[PDB]
Design a protein around this nucleic acid. Structure first.
Ligand SMILES: Nc1ncnc2c1ncn2[C@@H]1O[C@H](COP(=O)(O)O)[C@@H](O)[C@H]1O
Ligand SMILES: Nc1ncnc2c1ncn2[C@@H]1O[C@H](COP(=O)(O)O)[C@@H](O)[C@H]1O
Ligand SMILES: N[C@@H](Cc1c[nH]c[nH+]1)C(=O)O
Ligand SMILES: N[C@@H](Cc1c[nH]c[nH+]1)C(=O)O
Lengths: 409, 409
RNA sequence: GGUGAGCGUAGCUCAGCUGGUUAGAGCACCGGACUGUGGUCCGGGGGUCGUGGGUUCAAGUCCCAUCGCUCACCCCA
RNA sequence: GGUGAGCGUAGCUCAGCUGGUUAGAGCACCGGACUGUGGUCCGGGGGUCGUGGGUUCAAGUCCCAUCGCUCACCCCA
């Protein structure tokens, strides 16, 4: 009567194998670029994540938070282990569970899995271009075609302040034309209005001729973006240039980017990232510029199935033993143990009629069926059937492992 | 100024690789015995674990608990996914983080990692013997010699009740001879007295001639144990027969076992397990007998280092690019991107004096050094130095990937 | 978490007229036809028809509430 | 979490008399000797000597408290 809580699922079979293949490919791609793997704890002190989440208190009274994102934790790792003394920039990657408290729907859960990449210790645009390329290439190496790379810039703080003051200035005399959500947004989060799903809002934005965030980038942010774009253009990486890519937290600066896939539901963002500056100071350290991305293993799985990529059928045991009598069971056990783990060998735990056991072996997709009846037990032998060719040989036990080794090579 | 909380650490380099090797070996060994991999969520509803732990409440008011153990969660998985209709017994294994709230010391943390195995759906002693063998063989396959297998039985509930009434009966008239801890234990948990580290307690136990738990096993539990022992003896698995192996929770019945290693501190238990019956009913289901084990990846790492097993040196990049001028950097980047992820290729982010870059390449253990100066840039070329033989060739860029592929094969 | 909408019939996929008097099919597990061998034939264990109430001579069916699953919005690091 | 004990000097390994007047060494990062090539020579950025108080003419040093790390016990699924 006890169930996994809402927003969390168990993982096994093809789906788990799916996740594993994805993470393996990420490991390969990122480590080819010299990234170093990191694993941070599942919870951190609350302070590191407050800059909607699972928060509690240990007996010591300290407020802890179940990890909602990777980036901040990896910067904390940068600080704690004195990575400032390593050759900069330092590239880190991590794959693991993340926890958020929003209502589920397709591709959005309360416990999900993320792959994260961070390049820390440098402001160079080449790093940004590289991050985009690495995300793109993880997804590509999986096999995915049909992806949309979105690129933009949130600018430096002054720029975003300008854009907000401007959005407010323009939209305030027409607030009654706005839907409720957009009114609430106008009060504090005006750039969210730009992404509104309300048709009337988009219409009003159109007719008021609202300028993009692009037009509000200062000289520095703009030149930086031009360098990034230049690099992506050299590497022939196509990307949609976006009017704006709204980032919530205001330690994000300059480059912002996302990668989308069709189907897989409304939440079409496979992964996203960008540049940040100010994060490590809120963590109590000095100035460490960063650029990095995170993507969702689940949504990538969804995308992979959407494009028809499946997994090669799961390999079955090399030998499946079928005991015909009561006392044979144990013997099978013993025999199986003699063969493991060099071979994969399984056995039935109760006496089976030979046909039923043969069937249970075919169902599990075994290469060999073993028969142990009173004949075999009496001669200290086993019967061996190669299921692919229907061949059958009767062997002494002590000559069996040499047989299977030579047969399965 | 923000640190990982007490009892939790970050993981990278040799230690992480260590963990990974261990889990890989476990995967191999257990799957050779036909176990199926499972991953359950990090938190569950509190009910599944209360039969000292990280407990909280979501906004919905529901009490959740950060996973302190594997077994109960895997039984919950057995129930939820209708595994009663699979061919019994079903064998499951899982590797992942566990969370407990006790004070740390060597080999004992607040977030640690476990490997778990469960065989569910059968009472057959062969399963118990198999579980012991699988634990033993995981550790062995890692490379460990010098292990101590402890085996015993907690008996069926009636038996443990008898043993407790007996311990109380004997020890009560001599309570003043007991240390404080043992008095507290005598009040409720008398079998803990048997494991007391107090010398006076052990002396008193000796002189009162206290009988072992072994002498209190009823016919069923005893015959079961004899079957298990018989199987282990056939497979030549040496094990220390213990007077008692005290289990806390009273859904544990019959077989109990542990595996220990010297050094690695007081907490010398690498892993342990046994049989249970009653767990699935508290989870609201029917009767599902189980036997299984869990071991600590950390303590196994400690044991592996204690016995001198180290990791083969981490492979360095196939190519390390050294830009000599400002404009070469980007070029290096481009070149590196042309080569990934088929090759591992890295690059310096700033102009380096050739010797310093050569040194940075030797330090990172690269196979090839690339030189990009104005000469190379002007001829659209690169310089390539095989560090192992000191050879050096000057190549056009568009003939480089064919070169390295042929060189590194 | 807030707002919606649509689903809840065996472990899984599903049929079942606002009702009708003794709740069904495949898969899955299990046992027997058949003398120790290849994925034919018969039975079998199983469900509080998600849960509680209301209506009724009668509720899987209708009404109400509640819980869960699903998708969408708010939010999005 | 409770009870102990021992440690806190640069990112890492450590030296420094209950005191002495201008805090040190290796590693690591970084720059220059040296004209574009192999793991010699000089400098350099760095520390609130874990933190707060007390003592003193004077505190890394002594006293007190506090926080952290480590190990051991309680507990152990
Ligand atoms: N609640 C969630 N459930 C599943 N996947 C998520 C969730 N939140 C984020 N992701 C994935 O992680 C990526 C980055 O998330 P974010 O941290 O919001 O930038 C997204 O593009 C998704 O692929
Ligand atoms: N707090 C802990 N920290 C590290 N390892 C642990 C911890 N608790 C248990 N283990 C490991 O997990 C095994 C089984 O734990 P238990 O659940 O107590 O049977 C032990 O033998 C240890 O190897
Ligand atoms: N959600 C973050 C994830 C991230 C990874 N690195 C930096 N940020 C983003 O889109 O930017
Ligand atoms: N601590 C448990 C772990 C376990 C795994 N399976 C069953 N039990 C034990 O020793 O028994």
């Amino acid at each position: 009567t006890a169930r996994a809580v809402r927003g969390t699922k168990d993982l096994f079979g093809k789906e788990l194998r799916m996740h594993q293949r994805i993470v393996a490919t990420a490991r390969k791609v990122l480590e080819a670029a010299g990234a170093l793997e990191l694993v941070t704890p599942i919870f951190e002190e609350t302070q590191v994540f407050e800059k909607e989440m699972f928060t509690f208190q240990d007996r010591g009274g300290r407020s802890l938070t179940l990890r909602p994102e990777g980036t901040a934790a990896m910067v904390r790792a940068y600080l704690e282990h004195g990575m400032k003394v390593w050759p900069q920039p330092v590239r880190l990657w991590m794959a693991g569970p993340m926890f958020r408290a929003e209502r589920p729907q397709k591709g959005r859960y309360r416990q999900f899995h993320q792959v994260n990449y961070e390049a820390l210790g440098s402001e160079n645009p080449i790093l940004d271009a590289e991050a985009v390329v690495l995300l793109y290439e993880c997804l590509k190496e999986l096999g995915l075609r049909r992806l949309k790379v979105k690129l933009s810039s949130v600018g430096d703080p002054e720029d975003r302040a300008r854009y907000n003051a401007y959005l407010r200035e323009v939209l305030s005399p027409h607030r009654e034309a706005l839907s409720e959500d957009s009114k609430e947004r106008l009060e504090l989060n005006p750039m969210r209005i730009l992404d509104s799903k309300s048709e009337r809002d988009q219409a009003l934005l159109k007719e008021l001729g609202v300028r993009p965030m692009l037009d509000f980038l200062g000289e520095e942010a703009r030149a930086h973006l031009k360098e990034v774009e230049r690099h992506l253009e050299r590497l022939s990486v196509p990307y949609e240039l976006e009017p704006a890519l709204v980032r919530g937290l205001d330690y994000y600066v300059r480059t912002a980017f996302e990668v989308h896939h069709e189907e897989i539901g409304a939440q079409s963002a496979l992964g996203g990232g960008g540049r940040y500056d100010g994060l490590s100071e809120l963590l109590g350290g000095p100035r460490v510029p960063g650029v990095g991305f995170a993507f969702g293993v689940e949504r990538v799985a969804l995308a992979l199935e959407a494009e028809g990529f499946g997994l090669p059928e799961e390999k079955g045991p090399d030998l499946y033993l079928i005991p015909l009598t009561e006392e044979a069971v144990a013997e099978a056990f013993y025999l199986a143990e003699a063969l493991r783990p060099r071979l994969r060998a399984e056995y039935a735990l109760a006496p089976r009629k030979p046909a039923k056991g043969l069937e249970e072996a075919l169902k599990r997709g075994a290469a060999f069926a073993g028969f142990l009846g009173e004949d075999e037990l009496r001669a200290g032998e086993v019967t061996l059937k190669r299921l692919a060719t229907g061949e059958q040989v009767r062997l002494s036990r002590e000559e069996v492992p040499g047989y299977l080794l030579q047969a399965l090579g």
